[PDB]
Amino acid sequence: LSLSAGFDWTASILAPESVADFERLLIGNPNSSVVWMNYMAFQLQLSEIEKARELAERALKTINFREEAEKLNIWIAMLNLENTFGTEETLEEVFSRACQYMDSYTIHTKLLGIYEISEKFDKAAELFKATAKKFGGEKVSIWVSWGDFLISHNEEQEARTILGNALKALPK
Amino acid sequence: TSDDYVLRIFAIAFTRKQANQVKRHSYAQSSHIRAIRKVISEILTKEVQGSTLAQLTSKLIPEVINKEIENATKDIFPLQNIHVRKVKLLKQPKFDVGALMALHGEEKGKKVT
Amino acid sequence: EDISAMKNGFIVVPFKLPDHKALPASLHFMFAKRHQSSNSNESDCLFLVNLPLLSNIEHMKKFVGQLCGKYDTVSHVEELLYNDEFGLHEVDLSALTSDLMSSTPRNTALLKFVDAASINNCWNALKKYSNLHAKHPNELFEWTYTTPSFTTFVNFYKPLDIDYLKEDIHTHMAIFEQREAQAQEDVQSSIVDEDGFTLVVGKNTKSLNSIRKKILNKIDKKAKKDFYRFQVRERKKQEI
């Protein structure tokens, strides 16, 4: 005969609805942003913003560095998290950090969307100006999206001024 | 040392004049002498702690330590006759025959009849 | 087997596997999509996924040759870009530590062609190749897996040629002397900006890249509480 021991990949030898269940899922699903995000939301639904913040920090490191798309889910999730439940400063800290790790212009675009969804038009306009300043000379989409924002809010004259600025900044 | 040999070391060096020197003397003002003694203290401490007594004497024979001193002190001021003058062994640990045998690299007797 | 192409647009590319005594019609599939990029070196490339083990260039030279003969198409290949199947070269550490000597997914690589005439020829041929499995699996091609690279790779415990090493070290050194020498002159050459501002460079500084990295990396004690008539007036205020 021989020694045979059942394989243990969850360290047991030592839908999700609890703190454990998501962790047991994360044993086999470290690269799934959906599983991480689902355990982001459960903590938030429990009013545990602090335990939610430390979580995505683990998610940012746990996920393989090559899974850029999965990483994008967390960064957008944090932007939604800080925008909804946090303050201006923490959102800025995440926002600056998000641009540091990922394509900055993409991160700018997502926050513009987040502000529009959250109906924070004043901050959306300000971030449009900053995003256009940094990327206006290279990206036509920011000008089109910014023009879409103003036309949606019945600002035709501002759109014309913005289009003029688009021609000045963009290459011929 | 990490084998718990507490020792005291004494290092001696001398000032030297440059190749193009014209001044008769090669005195150094005190703030070198204070910065010299500091780096000498650091290197001597680093070597002894980072070496066993058997390993330590292995460094003494080639006089490597003087050379790191000479390189370490080269920026601050040129020196000469850098030497570890004297080495004392203040305290010893509990004696271990097994370690001693290893450092030196049992026998049955002969019937008397 | 009826599957010919995947919905997002990666086409199936089946292969017959070698016969080995240990393992007595098992197949290997690669997945390919036309790669589009404005970058010149990435232009005219075919994106490829799930490559066989140690799939360097001359493998595809056989397969493209097999496809060319079967489908009477003219297709030719320069090189397989981004073939890092071990993930050995993903970080260019030489570039990371310094700028001198280096100005600079997984299980996939980019297959470059000679011209647009070749890639479309192959891409059309590769479709007809894909449809083969549904009808005639036997006529599929077989992945040889053997090309002179594997003998070098399989021979792990091969000493390096000392003569080759000596020449290489000399060449890499000598170029380094030229580059470092040029850098040290550049920093200590009295750089002055167009508006008459003279850069400050310290002694023993070797690289301007060193200077910029330092910049990125990086009154109250002298103030007195009690000197001015206003100050003691504040003190007189708090005293009572």
């Binding site: 030592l14 994360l26 | - | 996924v49």
Partner: protein, 1077 residues
């Protein structure tokens, strides 16, 4: 201290007995007392009359051997109502909850009129006692039947404290008066009145069995039988005086149980004799004095810890057996006498009773060791020791508790051989009442003398000794005994002394003109094997010379001959378990390999001597930069290589040994890394070049090393020493470290975790490695057995395909803890004791929540201080905060060398880490289920291999065992050094290379040392793989799947097992033979 306070209370409440079971028992035995008073009296009877009275009764008198015969039993027998009383811990209300159960001691005092003043002679009183007990049982049973309680009571006889001279009745409840749930047993102790016999006549020196030799044991029993309530009164006063009497007492009780100490007799063989009572009596004796100047040692205001701590100090340092003894007065301050009686003695002048009679000298020595051993733990402030002191049972396994165990099978075992029975004889029945007492002394006395300084402590245990017998029988009946001897066999348990265990010659008395008494006993004890020999010093002494064997220790040989010569020529002594471990260690292919002892490190030193010759050559060589130092950092250089070095045995994976070369500091090192090593390689070219010219007898070549990730240009010089030994040379540069520090700084934040991992291997390989070898080699001298056990430990990992993922250092740091941290056990002194201790730890270790921190120091500076200790402790919490499940890091091994704690334990997959714990848990459970034996061990070193998803068989073209230097062979290096690869095993590189490909999908494992675990020829290796849960199931396809898969739908794929099976097959080429999926 306050932490210890609260921990003590938690232990107290946890073991506190539930008061309901108390009230349950007083309901019963109070009624039992009513039953006793119903028992009628009796008239004077002779032995003939009582025999007839008991002839037909089911009950039989438990008469003690020698049973009374009609001639010598002239004294009559009578029964009268005794004085019912309750004694023991329950009397003092100091009991605790015991899952196995506790006992309630009820004392029955015999009316004084039932005795004569001279009834303490020739067992006169004890025979009177035996019939009295029988008469009680006869009447108690019928009354028990009358009251209907017999349905759930079972009655049997037993010996108090395993004392054959003191039979007693035990009452237990089987499944309103039913007290089965209470887990208690009422013990009916038949004691004598106080002062029936003159205690002066019952002193240990005096005799009371006519045949003159003294009778300490028999004197103890009768006098102790007459002194029970007196001590109860003595304890009761002290309990009132000091508030914490009970709390200290239970602490002593709990400690005694964990160390397997009991009040039961020790001359009978079992470790014990010291129980709660003796601990309480000593503590009481310390609570009325104790010092040489009769000064107080414990104060009534002390807390439980102070009372417990003082006692542990008291026993640990003062000797009560050989030099010094204590006297106290139960009824006067206790004073420590310098004189000793050569036996553990606690004299009581008030009662003239030595409480330590039941202690054996051998047991006392071990007991003193434990007290001192715990005391250093008690004084410890850096680490908490509460659990180890109180919450760890070391008596579960004898092998873990004893270095060597020998089972001796006595001949003719339905009575012992006539010669053996003859040895017992008249003088010893008076001295040792029972042969099992006498024989145990005989085994101990010969064993202790023969072994002498080779051992520290010795324990003789008679396995299978019973103490309870049915009422229908007079004495205990053993299956092999046949009422003659109450044991199955005797086991000799030893605590060996590593320093002198393997001495080839046992030194003896020096020669003289007239043979001294010591010389005479030396010659007589050893007989023929005694010899007088001269040594190189010129001394002449009587000594006997042994032969070392790689398969057994000298301790085996000595005990066989000594026991056989003196005990019985027919005795069979066998310890196969140690033999098998010895065999599993690889036998080197060196001269006289078999005759070497496993403590011989001879092969290892030869490697250094060859290195030293090479060392000198390098230094005298002239290079542009002077050599700062050459540091060897190899496994062999730290005496941990699994297989001993062998000349020219280059098939061994560890044959090539690493060494660090450091030059003098210079500012001309290249500032770009890729130049830096190419500058380093340039130096090696000089070393290879000039070495070749000046020293042609040394051969050399270069190799490609990729251990450091992404540093693909570090080139190492391989030197083949003419002695037949190989070394790998690699240059360290002070700029190298900061360049890596440069890399992490400017690296992109996402990439920074990757680079620091590269730096982690860099420091692990160059910087920390030097410190690791330096500390380990020094400590290894003190820990003689550490070097082989870590090798065997590594051997065990290899069989289960675990070394490939476990770095050798981590195994070494794992294997050493029983040595640096033996608590609660002792330092391992046997290969068996050490290895199982390593496995025992790993099974019970909670890596998820418990860190591992080692003081790599010699036995009692560099000890971890409180500041450093906490400093490491926060590190574990911070890491576990980020990694609670422990996925990224598993084993947290830290020390002075590694304060980070992550150096040698990073990169190991979780499945592997759980296996390491899983395998140990199965291992210990197997040991518990089945005792250590040839079958169980052969299981411990065989791999199951079934659980793996797919298993691949590989075979090498030639047998590599001989070229590995393993004796079931090359004598020079090949002329063409390319030929070396022809005699190597590539699989360990194959699996590593295959692991990196399929990291996201597969975990492959293989046996690193094919020569050791590759069969007889050492040519078979196996590659075992493991699929993650994710790619086991089908997945929607994606670019970032990063795996070889087979489509099933137009957006679904599954793992391609078969192609993977092909690729490994061609990758092994002719090596692969078979697959198993």
């Amino acid at each position: 201290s306050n932490i210890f306070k609260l921990q003590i209370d938690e232990l107290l409440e946890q073991v506190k007995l539930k008061q309901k079971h108390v009230l349950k028992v007083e309901k019963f035995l109070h009624k039992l007392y009513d039953i006793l008073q119903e028992i009628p009296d009796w008239e004077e009877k002779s032995l003939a009359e009582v025999d007839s009275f008991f002839k037909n009764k089911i009950v039989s008198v438990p008469f003690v051997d020698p049973k009374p015969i009609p001639q010598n039993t002239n004294y009559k027998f009578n029964y009268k109502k005794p004085d019912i009383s309750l004694i023991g811990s329950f009397a003092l209300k100091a009991g605790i909850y015991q899952p196995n159960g506790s006992s309630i001691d009820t004392l029955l005092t015999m009316p004084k009129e039932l005795f004569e003043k001279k009834d303490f002679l020739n067992f006169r009183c004890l025979h009177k006692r035996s019939v009295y007990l029988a008469y009680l049982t006869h009447h108690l049973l019928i009354l028990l039947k009358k009251d209907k309680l017999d349905s759930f009571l079972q009655l049997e006889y037993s010996y108090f404290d395993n004392d054959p001279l003191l039979p007693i009745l035990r009452i237990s409840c089987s499944k309103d008066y039913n007290f089965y749930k209470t887990r208690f047993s009422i013990n009916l102790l038949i004691g004598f009145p106080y002062k029936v016999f003159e205690p002066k006549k019952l002193l240990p020196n005096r005799n009371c069995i006519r045949i003159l030799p003294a009778t300490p044991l028999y004197n103890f029993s009768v006098l102790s039988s007459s002194t029970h309530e007196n001590y109860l009164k003595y304890l009761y006063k002290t309990k009132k005086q000091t508030e914490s009497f009970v709390e200290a007492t239970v602490l002593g009780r709990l400690w005694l149980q964990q160390r397997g100490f009991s009040s039961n007799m020790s001359h009978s063989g079992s470790l014990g004799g010291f129980g709660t009572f003796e601990f309480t009596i000593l503590m009481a004796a310390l609570l009325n004095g104790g010092g040489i100047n009769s000064n107080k040692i414990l104060l009534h205001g002390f807390s439980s810890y102070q009372l417990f701590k003082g006692v542990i100090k008291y026993l640990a340092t003062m000797d009560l057996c050989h030099d010094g003894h204590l006297q106290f007065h139960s009824n006067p301050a206790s004073k420590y006498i310098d004189e000793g009686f050569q036996t553990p003695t606690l004299f009581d002048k008030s009662t003239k009773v030595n409480i330590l009679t039941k202690m054996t000298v051998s047991s006392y020595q071990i007991l003193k060791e434990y007290a001192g051993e715990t005391l250093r733990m008690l004084n410890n402030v850096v680490q908490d020791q509460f659990s180890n002191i109180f919450l760890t049972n070391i008596s579960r396994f004898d092998n873990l508790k004893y270095d060597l165990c020998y089972d001796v099978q006595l001949p003719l075992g339905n009575n012992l051989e006539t010669s053996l029975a003859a040895t017992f004889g008249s003088m010893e029945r008076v001295k040792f009442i029972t042969l099992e007492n006498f024989l145990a002394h005989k085994i101990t006395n010969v064993a202790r003398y023969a072994l002498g300084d080779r051992i520290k402590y010795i324990q003789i245990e008679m396995v299978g000794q019973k103490s309870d017998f049915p009422i229908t029988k007079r004495k205990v009946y053993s299956n092999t005994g046949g009422n003659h001897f109450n044991f199955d066999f005797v086991r000799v348990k030893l605590i060996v002394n590593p320093s002198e265990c393997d001495k080839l010659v046992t030194k003896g008395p020096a020669h003289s003109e007239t043979m001294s008494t010591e010389a005479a006993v030396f010659k007589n004890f050893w007989g023929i094997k005694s010899s007088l020999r001269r040594f190189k010093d010129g001394s002449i002494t009587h000594c006997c010379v042994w032969s070392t064997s790689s398969s057994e220790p000298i301790i085996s040989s000595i005990v066989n001959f000594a026991l056989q010569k003196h005990v019985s020529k027919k005795a069979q002594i066998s310890n196969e378990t140690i033999k098998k471990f010895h065999n599993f260690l690889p036998l080197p292919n060196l001269p006289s390999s078999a005759k070497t002892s496993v403590l011989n490190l001879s092969s290892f030193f030869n490697l250094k001597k060859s290195f030293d010759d090479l060392y000198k050559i390098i230094f005298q060589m002239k290079l542009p930069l002077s050599v700062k130092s050459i540091l060897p950092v190899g496994s062999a250089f730290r005496y941990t290589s699994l297989c001993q070095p062998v000349p020219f045995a280059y098939s061994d994976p560890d044959f090539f040994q690493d060494v660090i070369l450091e030059f003098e500091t210079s500012p001309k090192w290249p500032d770009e890394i890729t130049s830096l090593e190419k500058a380093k390689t340039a130096f090696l070219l000089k070393i290879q070049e000039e070495l070749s010219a000046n020293s042609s007898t040394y051969r050399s070549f270069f190799s490609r090393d990729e251990s450091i990730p992404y540093n693909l240009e570090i080139v190492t010089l391989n030197i083949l020493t003419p002695e037949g030994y190989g070394f790998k040379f690699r240059v360290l540069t002070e700029r190298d470290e900061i360049l890596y520090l440069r890399a992490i700084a400017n690296a992109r934040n996402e990439l920074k975790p990757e680079l620091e991992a590269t730096f982690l291997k860099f420091t692990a390989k160059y910087l920390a490695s030097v410190r690791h070898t330096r500390t380990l080699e020094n400590i290894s001298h003190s820990y003689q057995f550490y070097s082989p056990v870590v090798r065997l430990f590594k051997r065990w990992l290899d069989t289960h395909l675990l070394l490939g993922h476990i770095t050798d250092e981590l195994a070494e740091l794992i294997a050493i803890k029983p040595f640096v941290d033996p608590a609660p056990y002792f330092i391992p002194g046997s290969l068996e004791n050490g290895f199982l201790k390593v496995l025992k730890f790993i099974s019970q270790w909670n890596w998820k929540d418990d860190p591992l921190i080692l003081d790599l120091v010699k036995p009692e500076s560099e000890r971890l201080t409180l500041a450093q200790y906490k400093g490491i402790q926060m590190n574990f919490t911070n890491l576990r905060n980020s990694d609670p499940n422990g996925t990224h890091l598993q084993f947290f091994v830290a020390s002075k060398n590694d304060p980070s704690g992550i150096l040698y334990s990073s990169g190991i997959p979780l499945p592997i880490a759980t296996r390491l714990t899983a395998l140990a848990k199965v291992a210990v459970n197997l040991l518990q289920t089945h005792g250590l034996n040839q079958q169980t061990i052969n299981l411990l070193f065989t791999p199951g291999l079934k659980d793996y998803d797919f298993v691949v068989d590989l075979r090498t073209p030639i047998g590599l065992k001989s070229s590995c230097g393993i004796l079931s062979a090359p004598s020079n290096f090949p002329e063409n050094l390319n030929d070396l690869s022809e005699k190597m095993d590539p699989t360990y590189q194959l699996v590593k290379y295959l692991n990196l490909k399929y990291k996201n999908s597969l975990i492959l494992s293989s046996r690193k040392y094919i020569g050791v675990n590759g069969g007889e020829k050492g040519d078979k290796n196996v590659i075992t793989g493991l699929i993650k849960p994710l790619f086991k199931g089908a997945h929607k396809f994606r670019v970032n799947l990063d795996c070889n898969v087979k489509p099933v739908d137009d957006e679904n794929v599954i793992l391609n097992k078969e192609a993977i099976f092909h690729e490994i097959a061609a990758f092994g080429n002719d090596m692969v033979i078979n697959f198993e999926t």
